[PDB]
Design a protein around this nucleic acid. Structure first.
Length: 271
RNA sequence: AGGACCGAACCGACUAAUGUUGAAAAAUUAGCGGAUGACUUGUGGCUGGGGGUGAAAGGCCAAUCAAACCGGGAGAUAGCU
RNA sequence: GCUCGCCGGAAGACCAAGGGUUCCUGUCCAACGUUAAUCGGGGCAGGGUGAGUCGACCCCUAAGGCGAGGCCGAAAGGCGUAGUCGAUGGGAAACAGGUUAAUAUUCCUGUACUUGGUGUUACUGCGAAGGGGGGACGGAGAAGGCUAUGUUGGCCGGGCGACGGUUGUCCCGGUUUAAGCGUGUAGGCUGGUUUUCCAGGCAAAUCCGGAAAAUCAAGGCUGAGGCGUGAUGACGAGGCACUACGGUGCUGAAGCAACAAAUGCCCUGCUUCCAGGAAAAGCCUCUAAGCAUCAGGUAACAUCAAAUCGUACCCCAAACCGACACAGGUGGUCAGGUAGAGAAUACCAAGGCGCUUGAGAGAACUCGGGUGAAGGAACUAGGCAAAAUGGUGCCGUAACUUCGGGAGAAGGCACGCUGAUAUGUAGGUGAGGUCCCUCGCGGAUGGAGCUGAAAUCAGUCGAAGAUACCAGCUGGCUGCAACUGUUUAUUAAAAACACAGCACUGUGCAAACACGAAAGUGGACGUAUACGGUGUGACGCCUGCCCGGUGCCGGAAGGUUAAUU
RNA sequence: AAUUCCUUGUCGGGUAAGUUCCGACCUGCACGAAUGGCGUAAUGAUGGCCAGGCUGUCUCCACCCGAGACUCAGUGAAAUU
RNA sequence: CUUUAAUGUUUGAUGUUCUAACGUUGACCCGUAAUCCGGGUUGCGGACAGUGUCUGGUGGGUAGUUUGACUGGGGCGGUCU
């Protein structure tokens, strides 16, 4: 639940917590863990390509199954767990055959709840089927964009998409961004929304709370000298030029999509 | 519980005096700040010059930085001393 | 050699890194040493570093590096798979004592341990570049149970005091002993056992996992310390003989208990929180391909092997980095006594030093300090500096406020010593004995002895009892910024930079964007409650008018318009 | 006003006397609403001002303790010219 | 040879469809005890995309450079035949 701390110190007034006792107060499933070394926003060349990334708390990667291709085998939820590599929580499930796997935790999932994947699955949250069988107007998550590769849409805390139509081998969807996309009617999708909706209500309250996430401070650009940024300098706070990224692009309205290749799957775009 | 309080180690460097061919090519003495954290530290590693890195001062990149150092073009050019 | 003085959470002791003979002895004093020098980290010569158990090498891997093929690229070359390197991490085993002018957990003595090879004997399902388990992991906090260690008592030995007194409730010293083996406690986790079945673990599996039953509740794992053994020993203050007073043989007393007690061990635990906490091998198992009077496996005994390199010395410093025998810098371990909350501070122990020019004089002035009549900021750009405050407990404490704070607000009182309450209380610790007992490192009882606050009353000395070192000045109005933090190494620590929060905008994933001739990588093993960029800068009340200009986003009838033809 | 040239604006408070400071006035040379506006408890080695206490900061210096200076012996520089 | 409809062929435009180039940072199989790469099967896209040459626009993102003289000092102003 959302919990507002008390102002026992400057740094605890505006901090807001998102607690959940349903989560496992123990270690995760080790067989489904992997090393995850932080990068610092640097690539094989050692150069910073994405700024404002550095440090943070150590993290281990949980192998989550975004495909959900084990059809015809029921699975019961064992426990809900916390995942630092994503904004949503994950649910450890146990299949009847004795195989355990991690999945995204939908809105109304608990311990003991049953789920299943395939074409002959029931229409309940947590189950996964190709969208050809999902009734129109429904709500799903962890949607595939190409059959078999795995879910790529609606994977965040409280995100979802709504199936709005189905013409042929394609179905039209409205993503959480408002974009009206269409994908093949063979991509698997999971019923229901991802359950951590109260995640957005969280309030860090202090700077150090962002440094635990691996987020480094952001220096604006106005106060940064001409040689280091177009906005640069000026005696005082002048900024008498158009807002612009480094490397010289607007950043305040200019559209930068230049795909051309995948424009046939975008019905409406947004706004 | 706490980027919580006082305060040593530890990390810093606000004031003053001294020193200024210094003990020291930035220190000493007396006080000062932080001191479970955006902390500090050892070892090793990556990022290379119009580039790197930068909680951004044009700061740092081997006592050298508004474009490092070494060599080379090179006996640059110098209507000036 | 006798005194004096200094450090003693080091100015002591042991190491790494680094250095590389500076170590020890003898000899020499030109140069080196900021003076002399018989001395020296100086010169010359000689000697000195002994390991199956410490470390490296080695096995395993992290970041990351190289990278067969391969992809990419004018050439050079770049990225990278399989792989192979790479510790700052994981992985078998030795303790005490004695000894050299200089080394030792390395030599000697004593007592142990570990991993392998071979052979014999006995009993046998063995087998992986595969599966599983385990290794394997965070922060904070809370105690409890222990020890290191210390104090006191007792015991042993010695002593009877350079000056009054000191045969006693006196003084000094010592009272030490390990690994390992055995016991398996305080205490923590766990419910076990048997049989059947199974879409899983790339194939298989008696293993893991899962399902369903039956039968039992005691089964097991981990585990400091303690005790016993180790040890009829060793060491041992001191003695008997030699004694070049340089030291060597023999002998060598007591060698217990209680209390206190860690930041260390139980603890890779328990509790709790969000920021959700390495990998791989060794090791334990599983079977497959395959091999079965073999081979291999297991236990026992015997025997052999455990190589190679390092080991001296300095290591907060005269030996490393700083041009110096330079008030500098340099990571880890050991952590005594009194007072104290304390690793602060003061005085000491062990131990180590007095800082490589001295003597004398006692002017100005300079530096670092002490005191000060009366006044008390009149000094000055400015209370710069200095002075002052300073502790514990009780009492008590304003505006304002985001109700947490402000606040240690301010302010006021009491602190010593002796005695009594109480021949040392409350409290803590806990013996003998008794009772019980699954007869054990047990439980209960028992309260001996030891230790030991705080408070009250009374009395007493001093100018002064938080007496030393140590140790907040306080309050009021106001600007800026919310705050903690960050910054111009070497004249600027700030109202600047960050910041949480807010907003605009971009981005549908082969994402935008960025580094790259490209491959590709990061973004992200993320998927719009997400990522990037811009600006603002907690919170609270708000954020008005203008789209002409520039830019961005959209739309079209027309005009204008490139290559091309 | 961190913004006000004229300017020590005007009035008042505080002082024996206040170009600074506090509070109102508005005549804003040339504030103004996210290059944010106005408030804001707490915080700050932050800027400015007033008090109590305190003192050699000063009136106005005086004495004393030490290290130099001075003399002797030894070693033995430097900028400059 | 002034004139104009159904054709054949000719090429051009718009639209629809297909697959065979090309693409696949979709799935599966082998090389292979390999998330590289390649080959193969299939699916999805599909002559679009993307690349090359040419070309228009944008383009301080990044370079190389210019930004006069006289002058009762220079600058502002004025002046230059």
């Amino acid at each position: 639940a959302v919990v507002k701390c008390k102002p026992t110190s400057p740094g605890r007034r505006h901090v807001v917590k998102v607690v959940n006792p349903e989560l496992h107060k123990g270690k995760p499933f080790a067989p489904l863990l992997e090393k995850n070394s932080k990068s610092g926003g640097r690539n094989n060349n050692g150069r910073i390509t994405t700024r404002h990334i550095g440090g943070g708390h150590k993290q281990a990667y949980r192998i989550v199954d975004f495909k959900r291709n084990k059809d015809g085998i029921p699975a019961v939820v064992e426990r809900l767990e916390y995942d630092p590599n994503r904004s949503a929580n994950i649910a450890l499930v146990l299949y009847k055959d004795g195989e355990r796997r991690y999945i995204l935790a939908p809105k109304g999932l608990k311990a003991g709840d049953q789920i299943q994947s395939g074409v002959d699955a029931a229409i309940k949250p947590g189950n996964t089927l190709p969208m050809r069988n999902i009734p129109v107007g429904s709500t799903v998550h962890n949607v595939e964009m190409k059959p078999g590769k795995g879910g790529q849409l609606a994977r965040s805390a409280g995100t979802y998409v709504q199936i709005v139509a189905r013409d042929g081998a394609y179905v039209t969807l409205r993503l959480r961004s408002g974009e009206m996309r269409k994908v093949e009617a063979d991509c698997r999708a999971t019923l229901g929304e991802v359950g951590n909706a109260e995640h957005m209500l969280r309030v860090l309250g202090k700077a150090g709370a962002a440094r635990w996430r691996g987020v480094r401070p952001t220096v604006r650009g106005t106060a940064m000298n001409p040689v280091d940024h177009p906005h640069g300098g000026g005696e005082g706070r002048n900024f008498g030029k158009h807002p612009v990224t480094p490397w010289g692009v607007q950043t305040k309205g200019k559209k930068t999509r230049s795909n051309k290749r995948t424009d046939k799957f975008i019905v409406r775009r947004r706004s």
